């Protein structure tokens, strides 16, 4: 139940905000949940995906697969795992587009900032 | 366009009236806005009480002189007789009317006693600093009904 006078339940206002969201906003929209292990490891539930993270597809056809995020394709609202790809007729390979909400994070890529973030949310780390 | 046994009506709609229709859609709006406006004035105004002291007054004409009714301000005579000056009575939340004249003793004693009871039932904080928080009674009209 919305209660502030500055949230809008308007379904049109929302969809516009999502599709027209700027790159910086999509980073946080493209959040993946950490894996069971990593969650008790960091006291933290999920994190904005980033490139050299390690991930396991826990939904869809590529259920079970895993790999490193090759590129975050913020434009496409889609993340690409280099290891999860299509071959074509002409043999050629092509990335599949994956969504962070259907992935799980297994090994983080830690920055000075990536840590301070985990601590900003109230986590612990190794 | 005259027919049947109907009362002759006078519906003045021959100018471009549809141009000047005022629907008070903002009726609930402006009440919410008026309530908030007073809740801010209340808080700006320290423990002072939103309104000023109004006098008794006998309503004009042969139709309303039975009733008595809050007037504008207290006349220079009543203010003096009740023992204070015009200039100061204003800073004490008392409304003074330089225009009203006193011709009726009854009303006169009435308002001078109205000023006594007002003075006796307020407290005027010092100019210094202290500001001994004493919580606002909100009207004054309600406090000293007519």
């Amino acid at each position: 139940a919305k209660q502030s006078l500055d949230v809008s339940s308007d379904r049109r206002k929302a969809r516009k905000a999502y599709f027209t969201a700027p790159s910086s906003q999509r980073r946080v929209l493209l959040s993946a949940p950490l894996s069971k292990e990593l969650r008790a490891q960091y006291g933290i539930k999920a994190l904005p995906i980033r490139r050299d993270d390690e991930v396991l597809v826990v939904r869809g056809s590529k259920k079970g697969q895993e790999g490193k995020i090759s590129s975050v394709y913020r434009l496409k609202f889609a993340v690409q795992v280099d290891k999860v790809t299509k071959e074509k007729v002409n043999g050629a390979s092509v990335p599949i587009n994956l969504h962070p909400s259907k992935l799980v994070i297994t090994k983080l890529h830690l920055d000075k900032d990536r840590k301070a973030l985990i601590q900003r949310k109230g986590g612990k780390l190794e | 366009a005259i027919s049947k046994n109907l009362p002759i009506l006078k519906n003045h709609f021959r100018k471009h009236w549809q141009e000047r229709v005022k629907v008070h859609f903002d009726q609930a709006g402006k009440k919410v806005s008026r309530r908030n406006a007073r809740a801010t004035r209340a808080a700006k105004i320290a423990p002072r009480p939103l309104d000023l002291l109004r006098p008794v007054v006998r309503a004009p004409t042969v139709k309303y002189n039975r009733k008595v009714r809050a007037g504008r301000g207290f006349t220079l005579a009543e203010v003096k007789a009740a023992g204070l000056t015009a200039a100061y009575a204003r800073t004490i939340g008392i409304a003074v009317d330089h225009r009203r004249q006193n011709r009726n003793q009854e009303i006169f004693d009435a308002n001078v006693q109205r000023l006594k009871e007002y003075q006796s039932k307020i407290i005027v904080f010092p100019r210094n600093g202290k500001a001994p928080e004493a919580e606002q009674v909100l009207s004054a009209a309600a406090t000293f009904p007519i």
């Binding site: 339940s9 308007d10 379904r11 | -």
Partner: protein
């Protein structure tokens, strides 16, 4: 109000083998020549276009109003009307359903639901939930997307956390005796809302 009328379109008069609506003037665009203004023309003004000074609200006599809500309260007893209204109430102690005043002071949702269940509301809370449907109409994309049933009405005397504990459970509505609203006492003008009266509230009724 300016819709349909953003044209300087004239009739062509008769004598041109073509019907005599106003028509767009000029050339080079294929709008040029098309019927205009008319309520039967593509692009025209509509017939008797809607206006904001339509009567929206309605005056009901204050007293007729009370009679209505009084009556709506009266029938929150009468087991049959409540059943006939939806409202799975076969397994409740009695009607009216008066509950301990300790209900008004419950702060936490899970503890609230758990008592509602304890006193018999279980089946009705389940009617909602098992009933949420995608609204059939175009309303479904006009901020009226889902749909559901109406749960019990919990009437309190003093709000001490109860209104916040229940707010987020589907279908349950809370109300303060001194108020009381015909729209909840009789949703969609059917009588017999399942009401759980706190005891404090029950006595204040009188």
């Amino acid at each position: 109000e300016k819709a349909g009328h953003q044209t300087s379109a004239e009739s062509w008069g008769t004598g041109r083998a073509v019907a005599r609506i106003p028509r767009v003037g000029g050339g080079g665009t294929g709008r040029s020549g098309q019927g205009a203004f008319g309520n039967m023309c593509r692009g025209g003004r509509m017939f008797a276009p809607t206006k904001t000074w339509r009567k929206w609200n309605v005056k009901v006599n204050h007293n007729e109003k009370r009679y209505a809500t009084a009556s709506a309260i009266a029938a929150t007893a009468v087991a049959s009307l409540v059943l006939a209204r939806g409202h799975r109430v076969e397994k409740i102690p009695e009607i009216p359903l008066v509950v301990s005043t300790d209900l008004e002071s419950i702060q936490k949702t899970k503890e609230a639901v758990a008592a509602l269940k304890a006193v018999g509301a279980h089946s009705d809370l389940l009617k909602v939930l098992k009933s949420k449907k995608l609204r059939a109409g175009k309303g479904k994309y006009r901020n009226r997307r889902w749909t559901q049933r109406r749960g019990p009405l919990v009437v309190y005397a003093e709000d001490n956390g109860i209104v916040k504990a229940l707010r987020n459970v589907p279908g349950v509505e809370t109300a303060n005796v001194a108020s009381l609203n015909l729209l909840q006492l009789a949703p969609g003008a059917h009588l017999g809302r399942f009401v759980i009266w706190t005891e404090a509230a029950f006595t204040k009724l009188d």
